[PDB]
Amino acid sequence: STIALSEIVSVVNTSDGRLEVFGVGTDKAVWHNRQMAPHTGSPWSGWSSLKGQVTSKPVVYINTDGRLEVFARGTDNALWHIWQTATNAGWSNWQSLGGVITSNPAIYANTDGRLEVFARGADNALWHISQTTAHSGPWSSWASLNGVITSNPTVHINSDGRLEVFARGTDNALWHIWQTAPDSNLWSSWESLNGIITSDPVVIDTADGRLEVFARGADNALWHIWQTISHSGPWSGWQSLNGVITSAPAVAKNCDNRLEAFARGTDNALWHTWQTVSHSGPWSSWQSLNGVITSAPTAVRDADGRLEVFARGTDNALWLTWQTASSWSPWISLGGVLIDASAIK
Amino acid sequence: STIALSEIVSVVNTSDGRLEVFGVGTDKAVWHNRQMAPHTGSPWSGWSSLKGQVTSKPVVYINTDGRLEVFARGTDNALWHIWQTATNAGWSNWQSLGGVITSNPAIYANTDGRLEVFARGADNALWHISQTTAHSGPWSSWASLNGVITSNPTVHINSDGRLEVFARGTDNALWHIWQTAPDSNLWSSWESLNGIITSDPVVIDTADGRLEVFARGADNALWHIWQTISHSGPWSGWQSLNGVITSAPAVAKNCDNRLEAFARGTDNALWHTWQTVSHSGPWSSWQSLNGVITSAPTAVRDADGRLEVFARGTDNALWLTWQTASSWSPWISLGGVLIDASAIK
Numbered sequence: 001s002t003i004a005l006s007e008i009v010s011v012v013n014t015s016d017g018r019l020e021v022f023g024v025g026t027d028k029a030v031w032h033n034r035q036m037a038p039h040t041g042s043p044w045s046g047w048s049s050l051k052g053q054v055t056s057k058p059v060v061y062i063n064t065d066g067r068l069e070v071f072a073r074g075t076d077n078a079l080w081h082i083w084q085t086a087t088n089a090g091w092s093n094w095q096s097l098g099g100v101i102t103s104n105p106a107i108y109a110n111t112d113g114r115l116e117v118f119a120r121g122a123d124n125a126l127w128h129i130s131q132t133t134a135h136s137g138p139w140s141s142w143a144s145l146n147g148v149i150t151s152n153p154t155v156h157i158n159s160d161g162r163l164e165v166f167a168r169g170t171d172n173a174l175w176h177i178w179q180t181a182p183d184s185n186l187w188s189s190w191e192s193l194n195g196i197i198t199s200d201p202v203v204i205d206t207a208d209g210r211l212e213v214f215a216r217g218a219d220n221a222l223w224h225i226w227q228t229i230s231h232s233g234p235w236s237g238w239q240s241l242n243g244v245i246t247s248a249p250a251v252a253k254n255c256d257n258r259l260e261a262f263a264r265g266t267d268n269a270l271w272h273t274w275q276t277v278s279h280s281g282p283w284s285s286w287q288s289l290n291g292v293i294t295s296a297p298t299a300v301r302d303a304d305g306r307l308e309v310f311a312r313g314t315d316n317a318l319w320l321t322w323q324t325a326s327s328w329s330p331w332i333s334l335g336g337v338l339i340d341a342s343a344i345k
Numbered sequence: 346s347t348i349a350l351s352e353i354v355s356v357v358n359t360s361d362g363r364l365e366v367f368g369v370g371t372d373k374a375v376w377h378n379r380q381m382a383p384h385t386g387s388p389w390s391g392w393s394s395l396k397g398q399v400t401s402k403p404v405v406y407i408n409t410d411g412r413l414e415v416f417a418r419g420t421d422n423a424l425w426h427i428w429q430t431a432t433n434a435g436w437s438n439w440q441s442l443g444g445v446i447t448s449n450p451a452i453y454a455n456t457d458g459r460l461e462v463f464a465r466g467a468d469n470a471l472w473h474i475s476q477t478t479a480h481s482g483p484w485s486s487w488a489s490l491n492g493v494i495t496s497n498p499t500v501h502i503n504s505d506g507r508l509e510v511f512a513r514g515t516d517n518a519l520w521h522i523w524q525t526a527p528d529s530n531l532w533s534s535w536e537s538l539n540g541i542i543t544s545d546p547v548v549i550d551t552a553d554g555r556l557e558v559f560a561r562g563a564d565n566a567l568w569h570i571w572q573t574i575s576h577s578g579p580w581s582g583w584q585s586l587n588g589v590i591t592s593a594p595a596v597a598k599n600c601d602n603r604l605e606a607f608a609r610g611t612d613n614a615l616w617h618t619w620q621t622v623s624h625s626g627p628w629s630s631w632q633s634l635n636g637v638i639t640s641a642p643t644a645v646r647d648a649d650g651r652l653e654v655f656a657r658g659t660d661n662a663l664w665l666t667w668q669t670a671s672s673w674s675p676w677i678s679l680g681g682v683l684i685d686a687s688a689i690k
């Protein structure tokens with residue numbers, strides 16, 4: 001009935017190679033901040049309001065035409081969204097996709113360019129809704145994929161174009177459900193991947209087309225589990241990456257496809273562990289990137305192929321550190337005052 | 346009425362991170378070779394025949410569901426294709442999309458997952474045909490985008506999802522034509538980007554969402570020209586990257602998005618020039634990667650984020666060199682006997 005402390009922002013590397021971050025202010029409006037230039041250490045816009053009143057993490061996704069679209073639960077518990085009217089232009093007004101949802105939304109593009117949104121319902125089942133044509137309305141009716149879930153859901157596309165959703169169940173195990181064909185409303189049953197998880201799951205597709213899931217375990221270590229075959233079962237056993245973490249993990253790919261995991265430590269600093277040598281390599285010991293953070297970290301690869309990590313500070317500002325040739329940059333402040341608006345805590 | 350010596354193969358980094366190369370044998374069948382493992386220096390399958398009888402470069406493209414599909418002109422001058430029946434499964438038979446074509450085919454996915462194929466016609470105009478639904482038949486009827494072209498066409502998608510095609514005109518200038526909306530049959534007029542080019546054009550999208558075109562000039566230097574604004578005009582002036590090149594150029598992105606160009610030199614070795622520092626950086630002097638090659642080079646970034654370059658040798662085998670920590674590997678032979686089947690020479 002609880003999870004590790006959430007990520008405070010949603011981040012994208014945009015169609016013109018700029019990082020753009022979305023969070024919630026004390027006013028419950030959605031604010032965003034973007035790099036001026038497509039480079040590590042670019043100056044930032046500063047925070048501007050997209051307005052709205054939200055009761056979930058705001059979640060940005062890039063349409064297949066490059067237009068950003070932000071999804072959030074409203075004060076009426078409906079799913080709301082707001083989109084760029086054109087790839088490098090301004091924003092629509094907030095509009096309702098209706099429904100009643102009880103989680104952060106999770107979004108992915110189908111192979112046919114239709115966004116599909118997953119969110120928990122009042123019945124704690126997983127519900128979904130989709131664009132009826134590529135990067136466009138109108139949207140379908142809501143429908144349920146059943147199950148009973150106790151975390152925010154996470155969606156990723158398989159290397160064969162089939163969407164797959166991950167969530168914690170009532171038994172605290174990791175559960176998943178998948179499309180049986182791309183672009184379809186043909187889904188599997190919910191299946192258990194067992195384990196005990198104490199955070200939202202994080203899902204990545206490896207360089208070799210395998211889904212891999214990360215989550216905090218009952219021992220507060222970082223655990224992971226993967227498809228053993230590209231876009232296929234069987235799944236591996238759960239394996240520990242050790243550490244003791246006091247937030248949700250974030251995972252991103254180095255530009256050589258080496259996976260790197262980030263999480264807050266018992267000392268409230270940012271910690272990370274990475275694959276060494278190659279994307280098939282063994283994982284490093286956990287090492288500190290310092291800071292004092294009051295959120296999970298959010299990791300993304302920028303247009304220079306460097307990882308950048310965002311986390312809320314003790315002042316509730318968003319702070320930022322990034323990879324250098326030598327190691328990592330000192331934390332700088334992007335300012336703002338951000339709240340954890342997660343629909344599940 | 347001629348162009349710089351062509352690339353001998355088409356290459357992809359597949360949905361499971363393996364390089365796979367497609368060429369034509371002395372028998373005029375299409376042969377392919379694939380890495381066993383998703384890593385620089387992986388062992389190779391060796392050459393196997395997809396059969397057929399082709400009279401163009403065979404051009405592989407990845408469907409949005411990860412299925413490879415190969416397009417080639419047949420001995421009847423129709424467009425033929427062959428596709429994986431499933432992402433990591435076997436191949437269909439060769440099937441005809443009809444038409445009469447007089448160039449290599451050029452392929453891109455629309456934002457809605459529909460492949461669209463561009464090829465010169467008997468009238469030397471640019472024609473096109475598309476999947477009617479995402480990664481699937483049936484295909485549309487053929488239709489013309491007019492113009493008069495004297496090179497193989499090259500297509501790339503803009504950062505706002507609009508397809509754009511580049512080709513040399515009868516005046517030896519670079520010409521282009523674009524979708525006015527993603528997924529549409531609404532096209533601009535042909536417009537000139539001026540210059541004089543003596544190779545096929547090569548088109549890349551930069552990290553910052555700008556189309557950039559490379560081609561050999563009348564002085565046998567490598568020239569380039571770019572959109573100055575993401576997915577928009579105006580275009581820059583033509584700028585020389587110098588060198589004296591005896592083949593078509595190949596261009597790929599380093600994993601930090603630094604562009605790198607490859608071409609055969611007057612000494613018939615492989616030469617390259619790269620952006621230094623970042624994807625916004627100045628270009629290096631031309632430097633040699635040795636070899637004795639009888640084709641243009643073909644460049645691709647592998648699943649370890651390293652560039653790998655293929656070229657035909659004096660023995661008509663395909664040879665291969667790749668980036669190391671220090672510099673580049675010695676050329677190794679993948680064997681085979683490959684011909685230049687380009688529909689335009």
Ligand SMILES: CO[C@@H]1[C@@H](O)[C@H](O)O[C@H](CO)[C@H]1O
Nearest residue numbers: 025026027031047336337338
């Ligand atoms: C995003 O942070 C914003 C800040 O930029 C604004 O000045 O004031 C807001 C609320 O007063 C903050 O929550």
Ligand SMILES: CO[C@@H]1[C@@H](O)[C@H](O)O[C@H](CO)[C@H]1O
Nearest residue numbers: 052053054074075076080094
């Ligand atoms: C997303 O914010 C929306 C707002 O746009 C709407 O007018 O009113 C909703 C509450 O009824 C808010 O949650």
Ligand SMILES: CO[C@@H]1[C@@H](O)[C@H](O)O[C@H](CO)[C@H]1O
Nearest residue numbers: 069083131135136137138139
């Ligand atoms: C302009 O296209 C937008 C689309 O991005 C959004 O999902 O949905 C809107 C309609 O709900 C569309 O009008």
Ligand SMILES: CO[C@@H]1[C@@H](O)[C@H](O)O[C@H](CO)[C@H]1O
Nearest residue numbers: 147148149169170171175190
């Ligand atoms: C994933 O959703 C639920 C799970 O939470 C429940 O414990 O068990 C159900 C079936 O036994 C699952 O479908």
Ligand SMILES: CO[C@@H]1[C@@H](O)[C@H](O)O[C@H](CO)[C@H]1O
Nearest residue numbers: 195196197217218219223238
């Ligand atoms: C990841 O799931 C659980 C973990 O939470 C538990 O602490 O340890 C178990 C094995 O002892 C794991 O399988």
Ligand SMILES: CO[C@@H]1[C@@H](O)[C@H](O)O[C@H](CO)[C@H]1O
Nearest residue numbers: 164178191231232233234235
């Ligand atoms: C059809 O492939 C699915 C796969 O998508 C899922 O991750 O894992 C399933 C087995 O647990 C597979 O059967």
Ligand SMILES: CO[C@@H]1[C@@H](O)[C@H](O)O[C@H](CO)[C@H]1O
Nearest residue numbers: 291292293313314315319331
């Ligand atoms: C990222 O951690 C930052 C730290 O870098 C800064 O000096 O001090 C901040 C608090 O003032 C911390 O939250």
Ligand SMILES: CO[C@@H]1[C@@H](O)[C@H](O)O[C@H](CO)[C@H]1O
Nearest residue numbers: 254260274307323326327328
């Ligand atoms: C091998 O590259 C790793 C990098 O992945 C990590 O972020 O930071 C480490 C310490 O700077 C680096 O050594």
Ligand SMILES: CO[C@@H]1[C@@H](O)[C@H](O)O[C@H](CO)[C@H]1O
Nearest residue numbers: 370371372376392681682683
């Ligand atoms: C791809 O190279 C092939 C070779 O693999 C085959 O043994 O023999 C073919 C023709 O005899 C060659 O062209």
Ligand SMILES: CO[C@@H]1[C@@H](O)[C@H](O)O[C@H](CO)[C@H]1O
Nearest residue numbers: 397398399419420421425439
């Ligand atoms: C692609 O190769 C095709 C072959 O498959 C077809 O039977 O016959 C065609 C000639 O009619 C060949 O060009």
Ligand SMILES: CO[C@@H]1[C@@H](O)[C@H](O)O[C@H](CO)[C@H]1O
Nearest residue numbers: 414428476480481482483484
């Ligand atoms: C299985 O899907 C394939 C598709 O990849 C190809 O373009 O076209 C075929 C029909 O021409 C389709 O059947």
Ligand SMILES: CO[C@@H]1[C@@H](O)[C@H](O)O[C@H](CO)[C@H]1O
Nearest residue numbers: 492493494514515516520535
């Ligand atoms: C690009 O195709 C042709 C060009 O080759 C011709 O010289 O001029 C035509 C129009 O003036 C173009 O449309």
Ligand SMILES: CO[C@@H]1[C@@H](O)[C@H](O)O[C@H](CO)[C@H]1O
Nearest residue numbers: 540541542562563564568583
């Ligand atoms: C790239 O197009 C041409 C080039 O071919 C010529 O040699 O030199 C011209 C300028 O002198 C270029 O604009």
Ligand SMILES: CO[C@@H]1[C@@H](O)[C@H](O)O[C@H](CO)[C@H]1O
Nearest residue numbers: 509523536576577578579580
């Ligand atoms: C609408 O944008 C198009 C652009 O796609 C093309 O590269 O260049 C054109 C100008 O030459 C632009 O008008």
Ligand SMILES: CO[C@@H]1[C@@H](O)[C@H](O)O[C@H](CO)[C@H]1O
Nearest residue numbers: 636637638658659660664676
């Ligand atoms: C790539 O160039 C190769 C060279 O590396 C090899 O030693 O000798 C080959 C000819 O035997 C050349 O074509």
Ligand SMILES: CO[C@@H]1[C@@H](O)[C@H](O)O[C@H](CO)[C@H]1O
Nearest residue numbers: 599605619652668671672673
């Ligand atoms: C900075 O990296 C460049 C690389 O892009 C090029 O392929 O090869 C050069 C020589 O090894 C390298 O120094």
